[PDB]
Design a binder for this molecule. Structure first.
Ligand SMILES: C[C@@H]1CN(C(=O)N2C[C@H](CO)C[C@H](C(=O)Nc3ccc(Cl)c(F)c3)C2)C[C@H](C)N1C
Ligand SMILES: *[C@@H]1O[C@H](CO)[C@@H](O)[C@H](O)[C@H]1NC(C)=O
Ligand SMILES: *[C@@H]1O[C@H](CO)[C@@H](O)[C@H](O)[C@H]1NC(C)=O
Ligand SMILES: *[C@@H]1O[C@H](CO)[C@@H](O)[C@H](O)[C@H]1NC(C)=O
Ligand SMILES: *[C@@H]1O[C@H](CO)[C@@H](O)[C@H](O)[C@H]1NC(C)=O
Ligand SMILES: *[C@@H]1O[C@H](CO)[C@@H](O)[C@H](O)[C@H]1NC(C)=O
Ligand SMILES: *[C@@H]1O[C@H](CO)[C@@H](O)[C@H](O)[C@H]1NC(C)=O
Ligand SMILES: *[C@@H]1O[C@H](CO)[C@@H](O)[C@H](O)[C@H]1NC(C)=O
Ligand SMILES: *[C@@H]1O[C@H](CO)[C@@H](O)[C@H](O)[C@H]1NC(C)=O
Ligand SMILES: *[C@@H]1O[C@H](CO)[C@@H](O)[C@H](O)[C@H]1NC(C)=O
Ligand SMILES: *[C@@H]1O[C@H](CO)[C@@H](O)[C@H](O)[C@H]1NC(C)=O
Ligand SMILES: *[C@@H]1O[C@H](CO)[C@@H](O)[C@H](O)[C@H]1NC(C)=O
Ligand SMILES: *[C@@H]1O[C@H](CO)[C@@H](O)[C@H](O)[C@H]1NC(C)=O
Ligand SMILES: *[C@@H]1O[C@H](CO)[C@@H](O)[C@H](O)[C@H]1NC(C)=O
Ligand SMILES: [Cl-]
Ligand SMILES: [Cl-]
Ligand SMILES: [Cl-]
Length: 341
């Protein structure tokens, strides 16, 4: 037994099939080990550990991994960084995120919180020790968290500090909503996403009811973002190498709270991108021919609540995003690196 909170350089593991030209497979082929063929978490009886997803170095180390992965894979034709114009080739590559694991070196270990209602902050009773995390797809996106895990029971909200309106709110759905996005073949940048309105409006109600429990039964309002750049104002994600920008006004505004068809969101495949890894912009080539389709699971929402509403009866929320660290936080919340003393 015995341990103390600390961090160390982690290493990764994946099922990266060799020869596969998919850029996540080739990055994990040369940078990760094959996953443990025989894991085993030694359950710790009557233990109580304190976690903190918002102050966790694991998400920082995962962040630099995805920065590096994206930095070797999808290379932009022209990168406008720091005021420079570093040009390149931009071969249309194969893109499809693979689950990645994070495993302690000898001398350290990860603790996993098995409390089904754990919100990512503070005490946890059902603690267990693991050598690796689990298969985590590094899906880069804003507004909506796609292709992740779901809450095991009720809807969990996650925030470093709910009263602080500047701290991001992560909503962990206990049930996914299918997002189906397509770019029909022969405007080649014209695309759309289909969401079944009955599913979405239902879980959006459950979210608003759970959100009500954490704001003194205040009226909960869902409005679209208060301006900014397109990466924040629209649900942005990457599908088969193409950067999709989808207008989600029909989701935080169609407050059907004669409306339960299939919501069709408008989308544009953008070339000039505002990077998430930092710095500035990236210019990619026009989309590949053929039908560009990706069907993903909506498993989380990145929310931000308006400030000066203390003296009112409403709490308005808008979809957030931009810091991919919160995206990794959405799956690494239950994990925590401890060194054995
Ligand atoms: C977390 C921030 C990142 N950052 C920014 O400047 N921006 C501003 C930019 C527009 O304002 C949008 C950036 C974004 O999230 N882009 C994006 C790109 C592709 C896809 Cl697929 C996606 F889902 C999102 C966020 C720099 C800084 C080092 N970091 C703190
Ligand atoms: C604690 O979590 C583990 C993980 O599956 C499992 O044994 C069970 O859900 C919990 N144990 C108890 C005794 O409740
Ligand atoms: C989407 O969600 C369903 C049910 O929640 C699940 O069975 C399925 O495996 C998920 N798909 C992916 C790609 O994770
Ligand atoms: C999800 O959690 C909500 C609580 O906000 C609950 O009302 C609902 O029944 C749950 N649904 C599932 C499928 O777990
Ligand atoms: C998270 O859970 C802890 C312990 O149950 C509680 O003290 C804290 O207020 C919760 N935070 C949020 C944002 O729900
Ligand atoms: C009122 O606003 C301040 C910031 O201006 C914030 O610190 C405080 O938490 C708010 N009141 C409540 C009850 O949250
Ligand atoms: C949470 O936010 C409020 C509002 O600014 C602040 O007064 C309070 O100190 C914060 N809590 C912590 C633990 O920092
Ligand atoms: C996704 O949309 C395309 C185009 O509308 C359609 O052909 C396909 O059947 C849809 N799939 C799902 C699972 O909704
Ligand atoms: C919110 O409203 C419900 C009514 O369904 C009530 O039972 C509950 O106590 C209220 N919560 C708070 C924190 O006032
Ligand atoms: C999204 O579409 C609505 C119309 O439904 C429009 O008013 C809004 O400006 C669009 N969003 C952006 C960021 O342009
Ligand atoms: C949706 O929000 C936009 C502002 O972004 C506004 O044009 C429109 O009136 C809203 N829709 C509804 C039904 O209120
Ligand atoms: C709308 O929902 C009702 C049940 O609430 C269902 O019977 C009806 O078929 C739905 N409408 C459409 C067009 O699917
Ligand atoms: C949406 O999903 C619900 C299941 O929650 C289903 O009953 C309904 O028929 C779906 N509507 C459409 C238009 O696909
Ligand atoms: C989500 O997973 C599905 C199935 O693996 C895949 O087709 C889709 O492209 C993924 N979505 C994103 C945004 O990576
Ligand atoms: Cl191993
Ligand atoms: Cl060019
Ligand atoms: Cl309103």
């Amino acid at each position: 037994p015995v341990w103390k909170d600390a961090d160390t350089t982690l290493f990764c593991a994946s099922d990266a099939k060799a020869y596969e030209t998919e850029v996540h497979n080739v990055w994990a082929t040369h940078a990760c080990v094959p996953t443990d063929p025989n894991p085993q978490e030694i359950h710790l009886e009557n233990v109580t550990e304190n976690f903190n997803m918002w102050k966790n170095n694991m998400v920082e180390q995962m962040h630099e991994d995805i920065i590096s992965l994206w930095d070797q894979s999808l290379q932009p034709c022209v990168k406008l960084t720091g005021g420079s114009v570093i040009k390149q080739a931009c071969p249309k590559i194969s893109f499809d995120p693979i689950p990645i694991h994070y495993c302690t070196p000898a001398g350290y270990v990860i603790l996993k919180c098995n409390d089904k209602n754990f919100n990512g902050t503070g005490p946890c009773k059902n603690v267990s020790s693991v050598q690796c995390t689990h298969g985590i797809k590094p899906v880069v996106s804003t507004q909506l968290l796609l292709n992740g895990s779901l809450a095991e029971e009720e809807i969990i909200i996650r925030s470093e500090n709910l009263t602080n309106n500047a701290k991001t709110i992560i909503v962990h759905l206990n049930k996914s909503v299918e997002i189906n996005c397509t770019r029909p073949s022969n405007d080649i940048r014209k695309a759309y996403c289909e969401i079944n309105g009955t599913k979405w409006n239902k879980v959006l109600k459950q979210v608003t009811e759970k959100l009500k429990e954490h704001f003194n039964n205040k009226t909960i309002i869902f409005q679209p973002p208060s301006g900014g750049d397109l990466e924040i104002t629209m649900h942005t994600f990457n599908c088969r190498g193409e950067f999709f920008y989808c207008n989600t006004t029909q989701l935080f505004n169609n407050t059907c709270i004669g409306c339960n068809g299939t919501i069709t969101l408008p989308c544009k495949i953008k070339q000039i991108i505002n990077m998430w890894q930092g710095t500035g912009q990236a210019m990619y080539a026009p989309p590949i021919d053929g039908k560009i389709n990706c069907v993903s699971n909506i498993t989380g929402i990145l929310l931000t609540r308006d400030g000066g509403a203390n003296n009112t009866s409403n709490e308005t929320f808008r979809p957030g995003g931009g810091d991919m660290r919160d995206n990794w936080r959405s799956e690494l919340y239950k994990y925590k690196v401890v060194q054995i003393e």
